[PDB]
Design a protein around this ligand. Structure first.
Ligand SMILES: *[C@@H]1O[C@H](CO)[C@@H](O[C@@H]2O[C@H](CO)[C@@H](O[C@@H]3O[C@H](CO[C@H]4O[C@H](CO)[C@@H](O)[C@H](O[C@H]5O[C@H](CO)[C@@H](O)[C@H](O)[C@@H]5O)[C@@H]4O)[C@@H](O)[C@H](O)[C@@H]3O)[C@H](O)[C@H]2NC(C)=O)[C@H](O)[C@H]1NC(C)=O
Ligand SMILES: *[C@@H]1O[C@H](CO)[C@@H](O[C@@H]2O[C@H](CO)[C@@H](O[C@@H]3O[C@H](CO)[C@@H](O)[C@H](O[C@H]4O[C@H](CO)[C@@H](O)[C@H](O)[C@@H]4O)[C@@H]3O)[C@H](O)[C@H]2NC(C)=O)[C@H](O)[C@H]1NC(C)=O
Ligand SMILES: OC[C@H]1O[C@H](OC[C@H]2O[C@H](O[C@]3(CO)O[C@H](CO)[C@@H](O)[C@@H]3O)[C@H](O)[C@@H](O)[C@@H]2O)[C@H](O)[C@@H](O)[C@H]1O
Ligand SMILES: OC[C@H]1O[C@H](OC[C@H]2O[C@H](O[C@]3(CO)O[C@H](CO)[C@@H](O)[C@@H]3O)[C@H](O)[C@@H](O)[C@@H]2O)[C@H](O)[C@@H](O)[C@H]1O
Ligand SMILES: *[C@@H]1O[C@H](CO)[C@@H](O[C@@H]2O[C@H](CO)[C@@H](O)[C@H](O)[C@H]2NC(C)=O)[C@H](O)[C@H]1NC(C)=O
Ligand SMILES: *[C@@H]1O[C@H](CO)[C@@H](O[C@@H]2O[C@H](CO)[C@@H](O)[C@H](O)[C@H]2NC(C)=O)[C@H](O)[C@H]1NC(C)=O
Ligand SMILES: *[C@@H]1O[C@H](CO)[C@@H](O)[C@H](O)[C@H]1NC(C)=O
Ligand SMILES: *[C@@H]1O[C@H](CO)[C@@H](O)[C@H](O)[C@H]1NC(C)=O
Ligand SMILES: *[C@@H]1O[C@H](CO)[C@@H](O)[C@H](O)[C@H]1NC(C)=O
Ligand SMILES: *[C@@H]1O[C@H](CO)[C@@H](O)[C@H](O)[C@H]1NC(C)=O
Ligand SMILES: *[C@@H]1O[C@H](CO)[C@@H](O)[C@H](O)[C@H]1NC(C)=O
Ligand SMILES: *[C@@H]1O[C@H](CO)[C@@H](O)[C@H](O)[C@H]1NC(C)=O
Ligand SMILES: *[C@@H]1O[C@H](CO)[C@@H](O)[C@H](O)[C@H]1NC(C)=O
Ligand SMILES: *[C@@H]1O[C@H](CO)[C@@H](O)[C@H](O)[C@H]1NC(C)=O
Ligand SMILES: *[C@@H]1O[C@H](CO)[C@@H](O)[C@H](O)[C@H]1NC(C)=O
Ligand SMILES: *[C@@H]1O[C@H](CO)[C@@H](O)[C@H](O)[C@H]1NC(C)=O
Ligand SMILES: *[C@@H]1O[C@H](CO)[C@@H](O)[C@H](O)[C@H]1NC(C)=O
Ligand SMILES: *[C@@H]1O[C@H](CO)[C@@H](O)[C@H](O)[C@H]1NC(C)=O
Ligand SMILES: *[C@@H]1O[C@H](CO)[C@@H](O)[C@H](O)[C@H]1NC(C)=O
Ligand SMILES: *[C@@H]1O[C@H](CO)[C@@H](O)[C@H](O)[C@H]1NC(C)=O
Ligand SMILES: *[C@@H]1O[C@H](CO)[C@@H](O)[C@H](O)[C@H]1NC(C)=O
Ligand SMILES: *[C@H]1O[C@H](CO)[C@@H](O)[C@H](O)[C@@H]1O
Ligand SMILES: *[C@H]1O[C@H](CO)[C@@H](O)[C@H](O)[C@@H]1O
Ligand SMILES: *[C@H]1O[C@H](CO)[C@@H](O)[C@H](O)[C@@H]1O
Ligand SMILES: *[C@H]1O[C@H](CO)[C@@H](O)[C@H](O)[C@@H]1O
Ligand SMILES: *[C@H]1O[C@H](CO)[C@@H](O)[C@H](O)[C@@H]1O
Ligand SMILES: *[C@H]1O[C@H](CO)[C@@H](O)[C@H](O)[C@@H]1O
Ligand SMILES: *[C@H]1O[C@H](CO)[C@@H](O)[C@H](O)[C@@H]1O
Lengths: 526, 527
């Protein structure tokens, strides 16, 4: 009746030697184990790597993987595949360190259909991985190739392909621009993204530096240079430099930021000197965009944790630490006053959407949704609010108490007290007009209350009224999307008791305000 | 006796009409009332305004003041004076709105000793206030002058002195540059600081725009363009554009940010495109630098609150809402890797420093300091940690458990739950190496736990090891300064029970590590 809080030792015990060419079996039943998010069968996972789509339409996810412990280290590339970015199949480890004292750090993977590399005389489905090898004294860029569709990789003969004599030089993102390969790589502790060019992915020539932009934190990491379409006009696009920083994010630890601008194949130039943060909570880092997607599609995935507590979260008794974000569709838009904005929406959820739990059109009411019978313990919800045009043209018509309150409440059935696991509060007017508060109350979680970095409360302030809100709760994760993904937050929750229900309350809304609420159970992908 | 948690209605009841030419009496005895920070006798206070030092060395603090309510509105300039920025004397209201439908928003004040303005034919001690007047439809810059040393102000005859036909155009900061006046003013919702020039403070000419720099939030506010000396070399200085943003700070609501650069009298040019945040917590906003200070002394003060909860904090039963930060001495330094850094240190605390409560040289120990006998309920502490040169040249010598833990604990004597009111945790090594955590636990405060914006936990990560930590606790406020003020945080606390003691624990420190801990009670400045 209740998901296990602890698993048998056979499920959690890690091997003392790394398995080659065999899939690692995982038990995906833990009470904190997400059912629609990727997480590794066992061990520690961080940043996504080598994200690309085959011509056969299979999505390849690789990731920083420690197969020997529940903390960072011994980095290999784990591998999982999906046709829909929700139903994941675990694959054997894809990239190994040469020995016990070296590590495979982050990188990217590209299709080389025209065999510019020379690794692929007999296939048009060749994959090239470009990644950082970490030694005690250096970080260098290395190349590996795969003829079997990205499952098994062979080291390049003349590795390494790029060194600057530094041990802070990592996370290469390779892509095709017109007539050559581009590499974005971080000179991490110099707050510089170095852009290199190559015709064959093995011989790299310096092109330009992008330095000391936006928030510095303590290091630039996981650079992504991508073309992102406009939300309102698919035919228009702009280039985006996305940079992860860790430590030293404003909320503490790790965070991503972005710069809209122009790229001409050698040089990126930001449109302005403004700093812009992607997510208004703490648990979204090291976004990578999928290479070789179908026309127009900006698809990204991120690691749904924070370096300040990722190695301490109480999920190791359930055979894992860390999960990816929902896969995201990305756009650029202009929002009122602020201008440039990175839009993030969940990638098509239809394959995991189960039956309706509640449909309601009631304004100024409270809706109670029990989902103790939803075995996934995962729900999707949508809330649309349409203010009368009177209230839109004159905001002072709105009463000070006009609000939306969403609370996730502990199960009575599966228990061990009454604190919500998660809250969302939005005010249309009053003293905190446009303020959205997202909380994981300290009282709900013994582990959370004690961890000195596990921040309880997050906020974003809208200029425009809240018109749309989409949410996914998945056992130990809440993701929310506001105003068609204009604003986005990823938040981990570790409540003592599993979530059994949610309450959605609207109050003090102007006469003629329309409210539409839909809640659906999600189907487990494991 | 224990400090009262509620005051008599005569102490908290506000008048229905604004008093002119009379000092408003305050009761400064409340359990949350700071004893070494400025707060208004009663009513609601926000941003500091018109901050300047007169030639006789008196510091003038003005502030955004609602004399009629415990929330924002009806803005006047309140006034207080000090010789030392700790012993404050309340003064009558200094600037009034012309009528019931207008408000006096933020601004600055300058000495005009050479009478460039023409207001001062018979004095060299003339003060000029330049401030935003808010009407329902416009924000315009106005001038007022004072011949009595900044206590009573007269409107300029030909007000306003600057309009752009906007209702989002405010917070002028005026200063002398070589041979002319400069005004920095915010085109708030366009994320632009407009720089204007004037020979007489009444006629303003556009010079330049500084636009879309750093964090945008929802508005640019309270610009300050100041020359800040180098911490290591007083003969060197650089210009700093300091901008407040609200709402839309990363931690929510309000925060300040800065840009080191060059100013040539017309144009400010940032040295780089980097964004830099001043304070790593939530309760420091609208910093203003004092005009006409001695030498190159950079002196600032800020409002110690956050717009997300400032109007809801549970201090109105004690006749006030909001307090200023400690006054601060400012410098520029280079810190390892990050480079440019705004240094913030408490302005000379010696006039409020009372007797020693503890001096200890013990490493790897826990010191318990009771201060239930300190009537101010305010303490200063200094913690110096010197790692051996061995640990400096090879960091892997430091054990994963090498840490500093400071907890402020509720009084047993003045009880209204055992949770600390505030914590500071620093790790030298391990999985979160260099991470400093500052917390106001939800369990300590019923009001705090319920407020959806009152964040419990804040952090900054050092590259260099922590060598110095200075702290001031003052009833409802904690300020911490790290590595000679390289990093700074201001945090409000509203514990159910007043703080009675602090514990300082060091642990796991390398052999030969020196620790020096000093704790002193502070003397109340309110007589
Ligand atoms: C494109 O950008 C790249 C990346 O910025 C440029 O390459 C860098 O060039 C700069 C000079 O402009 C180099 O910086 C110098 O480094 C010297 C050596 O310092 C190192 O060695 C020291 C002693 O062993 C060591 O203490 C130091 O570490 C410390 O400083 C770090 C500074 O960030 C700090 O993070 C650490 O915590 C630590 O305290 C260094 O490892 C130094 O003597 C000079 O004063 C100067 O700082 C960088 O090393 C280069 N970086 C890389 C990786 O290439 C390149 O020039 C640009 N190219 C073009 C064409 O524009
Ligand atoms: C120095 O900086 C100030 C402050 O930025 C600047 O004044 C501003 O100028 C801008 C641009 O003219 C003004 O913006 C306009 O505002 C009106 C509404 O009153 C809008 O209708 C205009 O919209 C157009 O541009 C939009 C851009 O998003 C488009 O969406 C739209 O389709 C229109 O084409 C436009 O936004 C702004 O109001 C003023 N602000 C103030 C406070 O005066 C000044 O011009 C700069 N001076 C110099 C010399 O550079
Ligand atoms: O080199 C010493 C350091 O190595 C490991 O941490 C490395 C690096 O990991 C993180 O960076 C990213 C992004 O999160 O993660 C992969 C590696 O897993 C990198 O390619 C990528 O930039 C952190 O963000 C960095 O702070 C850190 O330097 C090891 O696990 C550490 O314990 C440490 O010893
Ligand atoms: O103008 C309409 C606006 O008036 C009031 O809010 C004004 C303004 O107050 C704050 O700005 C600063 C800095 O905090 O405070 C003073 C005013 O006391 C300004 O000179 C300065 O920029 C807030 O930060 C702003 O967001 C706010 O606009 C009133 O309280 C509002 O409801 C509104 O009517
Ligand atoms: C957001 O707005 C900016 C400014 O209005 C847009 O940049 C403009 O792009 C149009 C064509 O789409 C040009 O005609 C203008 O000259 C540009 N303005 C400036 C000053 O650069 C930008 O395209 C918009 N972005 C999105 C995502 O809609
Ligand atoms: C921090 O370091 C920077 C970089 O060295 C210093 O900037 C230089 O300052 C010197 C003298 O002031 C100039 O001669 C150089 O041309 C400057 N270089 C750059 C790139 O700006 C800066 O002075 C230092 N700041 C502090 C506070 O020490
Ligand atoms: C491990 O591999 C790295 C990278 O090739 C190499 O530099 C190092 O010498 C190897 N270690 C040993 C002990 O062979
Ligand atoms: C890549 O091309 C460059 C010059 O075009 C050349 O130096 C290098 O040998 C090439 N590498 C391969 C493996 O073809
Ligand atoms: C791209 O533009 C930069 C200047 O912004 C220029 O120096 C560089 O050569 C350009 N590259 C190409 C290939 O046009
Ligand atoms: C908006 O309605 C308020 C009353 O709630 C009124 O005082 C104000 O003048 C109106 N403004 C406009 C733009 O109609
Ligand atoms: C909601 O309640 C408010 C206050 O009671 C009322 O004025 C308003 O008409 C109601 N709104 C709707 C949409 O029912
Ligand atoms: C809200 O409107 C959007 C428009 O795209 C629609 O997709 C969604 O079904 C609506 N949500 C609800 C709860 O009706
Ligand atoms: C209030 O005074 C301001 C500034 O002098 C003026 O613009 C406005 O007309 C006055 N309003 C009323 C209602 O008298
Ligand atoms: C006053 O005049 C003196 C020289 O006579 C000049 O040095 C100083 O800068 C002037 N001060 C102001 C504030 O105008
Ligand atoms: C001018 O100043 C002196 C000294 O302050 C004073 O005695 C005299 O009366 C003043 N005259 C005027 C016009 O104020
Ligand atoms: C200030 O000086 C300007 C230019 O010299 C002039 O236009 C203006 O009338 C002066 N104002 C006063 C009050 O002297
Ligand atoms: C100040 O610098 C700007 C550009 O940085 C220049 O256009 C302007 O003429 C300069 N003004 C003076 C007073 O030198
Ligand atoms: C602690 O170190 C500071 C410098 O950071 C020094 O000035 C101060 O005297 C030291 N404190 C004590 C009590 O020695
Ligand atoms: C640093 O100390 C470690 C042990 O803590 C030792 O193994 C290593 O050899 C030392 N390296 C240097 C810098 O001497
Ligand atoms: C301080 O508390 C932290 C947080 O739990 C702990 O990890 C550390 O070992 C403690 N050290 C001391 C000085 O008590
Ligand atoms: C502090 O204690 C640690 C172990 O907890 C010990 O290794 C070290 O020698 C001690 N250092 C000092 C300075 O007493
Ligand atoms: C997880 O927690 C449950 C109680 O909720 C225990 O039964 C189990 O042993 C594990 O501690
Ligand atoms: C996985 O965790 C279980 C329970 O803590 C252990 O039995 C096992 O040794 C491994 O640590
Ligand atoms: C502060 O607590 C005191 C108890 O001493 C009460 O008098 C007052 O109501 C407030 O709660
Ligand atoms: C202030 O008001 C409080 C009300 O809670 C009293 O309890 C207290 O004694 C004082 O009158
Ligand atoms: C000032 O606050 C006190 C205590 O809450 C009240 O007695 C008075 O009416 C006013 O609210
Ligand atoms: C404020 O209003 C009070 C009554 O509420 C009067 O007594 C007073 O004169 C002033 O008008
Ligand atoms: C002092 O002036 C103020 C504002 O003009 C008034 O509140 C009061 O009536 C007296 O005239």
């Amino acid at each position: 009746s209740c998901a296990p809080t602890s698993l048998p030792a056979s499920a959690t015990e890690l091997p003392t030697t790394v398995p080659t060419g065999t899939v690692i079996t995982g038990d995906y039943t833990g009470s904190y184990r997400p059912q629609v998010h990727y997480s590794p069968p066992k061990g520690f996972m961080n940043a996504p790597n080598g994200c690309h789509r085959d011509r056969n339409g299979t999505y390849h996810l690789y990731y920083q993987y420690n197969p020997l412990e529940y903390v960072a280290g011994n980095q290999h590339w784990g591998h999982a595949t999906s046709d829909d970015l929700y139903h994941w199949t675990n694959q054997p480890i894809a990239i190994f360190p040469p020995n016990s004292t070296s590590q495979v750090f982050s990188g990217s993977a590209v299709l080389d259909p025209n065999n510019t590399s020379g690794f692929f005389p007999n296939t048009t489905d060749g994959v090239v991985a470009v990644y950082t090898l970490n030694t005690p004294t250096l970080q260098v860029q290395e190349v590996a190739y795969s003829t079997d569709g990205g499952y098994n990789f062979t080291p390049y003969e003349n590795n390494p392909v790029l060194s600057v004599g530094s041990n802070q030089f990592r996370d290469p993102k390779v892509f095709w621009y017109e007539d050559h390969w581009v590499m974005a790589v971080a000179a991490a502790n110099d707050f510089t993204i170095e852009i290199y060019t190559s015709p064959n992915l093995t011989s790299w020539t310096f092109a330009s530096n992008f330095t000391h932009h936006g928030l510095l934190g303590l290091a630039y990491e996981c650079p992504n240079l991508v073309q992102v379409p406009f939300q309102d006009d698919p035919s228009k696009s702009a280039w985006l430099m996305y940079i992860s920083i860790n430590p030293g994010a404003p909320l503490g630890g790790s965070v991503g930021q972005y710069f809209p601008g122009d790229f001409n194949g050698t040089h990126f130039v930001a449109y302005d000197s403004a700093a812009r943060i992607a997510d208004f909570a703490k648990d979204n880092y090291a976004s990578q965009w999928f290479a070789d997607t179908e026309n127009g599609e900006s698809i990204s995935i991120a690691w749904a944790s924070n370096w300040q507590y990722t190695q301490q979260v109480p999920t190791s008794a359930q055979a894992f630490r860390s999960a990816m974000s929902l896969p995201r569709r990305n756009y650029l838009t202009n929002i009122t006053r602020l201008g440039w904005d990175l839009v993030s929406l969940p990638y098509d959820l239809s394959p995991v959407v189960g039956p309706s739990l509640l449909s309601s059109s009631e304004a100024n009411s409270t809706a109670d949704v029990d989902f103790t019978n939803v075995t996934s313990n995962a729900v999707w919800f949508s809330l649309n609010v349409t203010l009368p045009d009177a209230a839109i043209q004159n905001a002072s018509l709105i009463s000070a108490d006009a609000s939306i309150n969403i609370t996730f409440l502990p199960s009575t059935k599966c228990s061990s007290s009454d604190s919500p696991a998660a809250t969302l509060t939005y005010f249309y007017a009053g003293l905190t007009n446009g303020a959205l508060a997202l909380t994981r109350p300290a009282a709900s979680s013994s582990w959370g209350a004690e961890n000195p970095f596990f921040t309880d409360k997050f906020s974003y302030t809208l200029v425009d009224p809240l018109t749309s809100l989409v949410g996914v709760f998945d056992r130990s994760m809440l993701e929310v999307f506001v105003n068609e993904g204009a604003h986005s937050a990823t938040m981990l929750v570790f409540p003592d008791s599993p979530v059994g229900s949610m309450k959605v309350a609207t109050g003090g809304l102007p006469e003629g305000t329309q409210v539409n609420l839909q809640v659906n159970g999600l189907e487990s992908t494991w």
